[PDB]
Amino acid sequence: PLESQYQVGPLLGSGGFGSVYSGIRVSDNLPVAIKHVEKDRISDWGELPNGTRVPMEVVLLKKVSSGFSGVIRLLDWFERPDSFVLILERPEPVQDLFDFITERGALQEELARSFFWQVLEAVRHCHNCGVLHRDIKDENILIDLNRGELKLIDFGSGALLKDTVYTDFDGTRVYSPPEWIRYHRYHGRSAAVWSLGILLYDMVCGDIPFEHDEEIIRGQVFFRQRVSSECQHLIRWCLALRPSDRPTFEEIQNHPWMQDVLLPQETAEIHLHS
Ligand SMILES: Cn1c(-c2ccc(N3CCNCC3)cc2)c(-c2ccc(CO)cc2)c2c(Cl)ccnc21
C-alpha cells in the first residue's frame, strides 16, 4: 500500500538511477526519498534469502544499511508490475556534491580534506559489509548541509566484494582505471582507490583530470589549480598506473595530507554557513 504509507512531493531528479521524488512517511513525518526504477532498465539483477529476484541495488543496500550515517540507508522497498520503488532516507537540506562543486568551483583543501575523509570512511564501511560500489564520483555523494555529513548513494552499478578479478563494469568510464580500459580486468579495492583519486582531484581542481581513454592510459596528471604538494602527492599515488602501486585505505588515511581532519559539524559551521 505504497501511496497510503507515503506522501509524494516534487520530482527531485532523474537519471541512470531512475526517478527520485521527495516524500514523507505518513507514520512519523520522516523525510524520505522515493526512487522508481523500470524493470526493463535494470542493468544487473540480484536476490535475497527468500527467493525474490530484485535489483542488485537492493541486495547491496540491505548489506550496508546498518545505522551508519555515511551511506543513504534503505528504509523499505516495493515491487510493482513493471517497476521497483525504493524508500531511502532524505536529509534536509541536501545538495549533491556535483552541484556543490559546480556552484563553488575548486574547494578549499580544508573542506576537501573533511569531505574526502568522510568518503573514505563510507567506502570502508561498504567494503567491510561485503559491498563494492564501483561508481564512486561526486554525483553519487550527498551533503547533509546542516550537519556537514556526506552520504553515498547509487549502488546500481555495484557488486558483492570479492578477491578475484572483475571482468564486467558498468560505472562511469572517466572514473574507471587504466587496467579496465586496456584489459577489461580490475580488482575491486585498487579500482576503488583509482576512482577516489579522480574524486579528490575533482574536489581540489573543480573538474576531473581525464576526459579520454588515452589520458587515462597515460596517467599523467596536470594540475590547473594551485594545490599543495602533499595533496598532489596523495592524488598521484591513488592514480598510480599499476594497481599494486596504489595506496591502501590505511595508507590514504595515514597520509600527511589527511591529518587533522575537521569534524563534520565543524565543517558545516566554517564552510557550509550552517
Ligand atoms: C538519487 N538521489 C538524488 C539525486 C537527485 C538528483 C540527482 N541529479 C542528477 C544530476 N545532478 C542533478 C540531479 C542525482 C541524485 C537525491 C537527491 C535529492 C535531493 C537533492 C537536492 O535537492 C539532490 C539529490 C537523492 C536522495 Cl536525497 C536520496 C536518495 N537518492 C537520491
Side-chain angles (χ1 to χ4, degrees):
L2 157 59
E3 308 93 324
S4 64
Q5 279 198 250
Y6 300 97
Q7 312 281 263
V8 183
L11 177 72
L12 296 167
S14 71
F17 55 78
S19 297
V20 190
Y21 294 81
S22 186
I24 295 149
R25 191 212 271 149
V26 184
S27 155
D28 66 339
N29 289 265
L30 182 76
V32 306
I34 306 169
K35 182 161 87 79
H36 299 251
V37 316
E38 292 188 19
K39 287 179 179 180
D40 316 77
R41 294 170 181 164
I42 298 178
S43 67
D44 190 30
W45 290 78
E47 190 269 3
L48 311 67
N50 82 332
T52 315
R53 210 173 175 71
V54 304
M56 188 57 72
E57 169 180 17
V58 164
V59 185
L60 304 183
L61 276 161
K62 295 167 82 66
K63 291 173 69 65
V64 302
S65 288
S66 90
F68 184 63
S69 82
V71 189
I72 287 281
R73 293 213 287 157
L74 182 68
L75 310 176
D76 209 346
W77 61 274
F78 304 86
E79 178 169 5
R80 278 177 170 182
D82 287 315
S83 64
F84 281 91
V85 185
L86 278 60
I87 314 291
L88 299 152
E89 34 185 10
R90 168 168 70 80
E92 160 61 39
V94 65
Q95 187 178 23
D96 192 89
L97 176 61
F98 178 94
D99 302 322
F100 182 92
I101 292 173
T102 293
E103 278 183 2
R104 303 188 26 164
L107 306 186
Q108 309 210 149
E109 284 194 30
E110 182 189 65
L111 178 53
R113 170 181 305 111
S114 166
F115 279 6
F116 194 61
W117 181 271
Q118 290 183 60
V119 176
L120 281 158
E121 290 290 320
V123 175
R124 290 180 51 204
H125 171 78
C126 290
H127 291 198
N128 293 135
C129 301
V131 166
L132 191 72
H133 191 281
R134 300 203 289 189
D135 202 23
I136 298 160
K137 61 176 177 173
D138 57 352
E139 293 183 83
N140 290 332
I141 295 169
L142 303 188
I143 310 168
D144 175 344
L145 294 156
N146 281 169
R147 296 192 174 282
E149 307 181 354
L150 267 45
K151 289 165 134 49
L152 282 183
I153 62 178
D154 191 21
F155 290 77
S157 309
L160 298 171
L161 183 62
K162 66 186 183 180
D163 297 305
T164 45
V165 72
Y166 295 82
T167 55
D168 66 305
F169 175 72
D170 192 45
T172 308
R173 179 174 263 252
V174 290
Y175 279 76
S176 69
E179 61 275 21
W180 165 252
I181 310 289
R182 279 187 187 241
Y183 312 118
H184 294 279
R185 298 171 56 84
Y186 64 96
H187 288 79
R189 296 156 181 94
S190 52
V193 168
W194 175 277
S195 74
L196 290 164
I198 306 294
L199 174 70
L200 180 50
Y201 185 98
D202 189 31
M203 285 190 289
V204 298
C205 294
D207 269 291
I208 60 172
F210 310 127
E211 291 285 347
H212 299 111
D213 289 356
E214 323 80 42
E215 295 178 298
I216 300 166
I217 274 70
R218 179 166 182 249
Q220 182 69 32
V221 180
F222 172 80
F223 284 90
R224 65 190 95 187
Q225 306 269 342
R226 156 72 199 190
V227 169
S228 69
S229 297
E230 293 189 337
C231 184
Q232 290 200 20
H233 178 273
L234 178 57
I235 290 181
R236 295 194 161 96
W237 195 6
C238 295
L239 299 181
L241 279 180
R242 296 174 60 234
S244 60
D245 291 337
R246 293 178 205 151
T248 59
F249 295 130
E250 171 169 24
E251 288 177 306
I252 295 170
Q253 293 193 289
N254 283 326
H255 187 277
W257 190 73
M258 287 289 270
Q259 296 317 290
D260 304 314
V261 61
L262 300 179
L263 314 175
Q265 188 59 50
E266 310 182 76
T267 302
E269 283 162 6
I270 315 187
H271 291 286
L272 309 176
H273 298 294
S274 191

